[PDB]
Design a protein around this ligand. Sequence first.
Ligand code: OXL
Length: 633
Amino acid sequence: MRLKVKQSELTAAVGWNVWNELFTCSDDQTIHKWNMLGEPEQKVSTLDAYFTDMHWYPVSSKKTQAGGTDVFAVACTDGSVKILSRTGRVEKSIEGHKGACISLRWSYDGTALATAGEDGSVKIWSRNGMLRSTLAQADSPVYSIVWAYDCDQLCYCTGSNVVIKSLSSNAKQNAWKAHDGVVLKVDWSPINHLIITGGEDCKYKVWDSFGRLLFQSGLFDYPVTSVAWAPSGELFAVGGFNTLQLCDRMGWAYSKIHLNDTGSIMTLSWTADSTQLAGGGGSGGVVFGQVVDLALEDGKMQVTVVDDMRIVVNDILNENADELPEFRDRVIKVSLGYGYLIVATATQCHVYNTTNLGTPHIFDLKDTVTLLLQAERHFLLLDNSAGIQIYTYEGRQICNPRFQGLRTELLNAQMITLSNDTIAVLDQQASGTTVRFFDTAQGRPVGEPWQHTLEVKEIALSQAGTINDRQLIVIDRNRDLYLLPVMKRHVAKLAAMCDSARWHDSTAMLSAMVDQRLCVWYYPSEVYVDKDLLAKTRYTKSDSDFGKSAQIQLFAGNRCLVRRSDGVLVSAATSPYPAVLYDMIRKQQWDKATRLCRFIKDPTMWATLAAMAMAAKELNTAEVAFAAIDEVD
Ligand SMILES: O=C([O-])C(=O)[O-]
């Protein structure tokens, strides 16, 4: 994918509302409205004041919108902070700072407004403009502030440093030196908890919430002047001197675009649906970017989302391409798998059998789709109104799993996982981190919710077999990898120093990054049975280093595709044999499996077969396998 860019003294601030209007604040002392086509529509207001920053009152869903929430706040150079309506009516003007107010953000729950001054103060206000508290007084201008999602913590920069402070508690403000120079912008994703920064050392960087560096860019020619997370948390944008870059959440860049005489891009804002962004530059021009050329593939099928109207389906059964009919509303979310293509527009969900593109099943959407997941039998669609929805591939809603205190706007693909019989959801709260399971038939809770002692980074369900086969992996914040069956549910630790893990597409096998090495478990369940045989069915490629923070993108057939932190996709061969053993054994062909193992004389396959045999209680076979293993010793 890439950023498709369109360009419209200084344009000081930009911000999209949930109605997909872009408001821009310029040094002409005017505020203008723009539409998603990147066209100017109206002068909304004119003020005797210069602008530095703006923020729309945050709305989780325009469907659950009702209230006086159609307002935005603007920071001014005279130190005032003004709340304006969508129509430009001044609701409230606040004398917030001495000298310019240079950054501000509404809390996510809308109960507070945070402002920061060149005077180095960070202040917290009620909407009534009352001073709620002075959070901080730094020794340098606080160029950028953002909230934690719970609104009990604020992240801000001062000098070279990033600071995280609690509003309620005191404890210890976490702080670190982020850049070798002045930090110019920060952002903190509420959905993936990652922090991004850019500054005068001419780099951008990605951090976790604890100050651990996850990515640092090479040198730009000039300071990085803005960074912004897409609401999806899967992408962020970077602005600089006549440049705009689109980055993966891992940090590496999809595209770097040179802009036409914009000066530095000082301000960034994304649309709520993460498909577009806007940037304000020192020149005063407004830049519009659209995320395009999304590529999906599954087996022989390749799908390219050309733009928000146009999709091509490439069916390489004979080097083919089919252009889908142009979409009547903007394409928002697309997913491919299991022989089906799902296209969610702003108002409709299309489900295509990829072999019969001419007859999709289509149903109405009443809210913005925020996630699509697919399994063999059905798929999952998420929005912030009805929440978690499980659909047949003919478009019939099967169930709507829910639980008290579920916050759907915080779920990404790391937090919720689907399979043929089970859904698992990470329920993250100040009180506790627990994994909750639900069945896909009725959406009813399955078993007792599982509590971990540490914060969890991500969870994922295995795909093969039945409910008794269903397993969850858990990676926690210490980078420990756990295995947890849905039904027997007794946890086991599989690895330390785990950066990633992925279930095999078609079998119970598991892959993971373990201290930067590729490790494969041919039979992960063995950990509950026999630690010694578990080790014999676990293979680590000792000499292949995937670097820091590598992410497994696919584990299927006999290959594992691994995305490195630097954006390089590595293809690693795994054993050609264990999937064949799985196939043979589900067909009860124990004779054939023993013959195969006798032919390849591979101790790890003998161990895998022995594990399979013991679980099936094929004792004759297990005996042969153990005999073969003990023989090579
Ligand atoms: O996505 C890819 O294959 C790449 O990195 O070129």
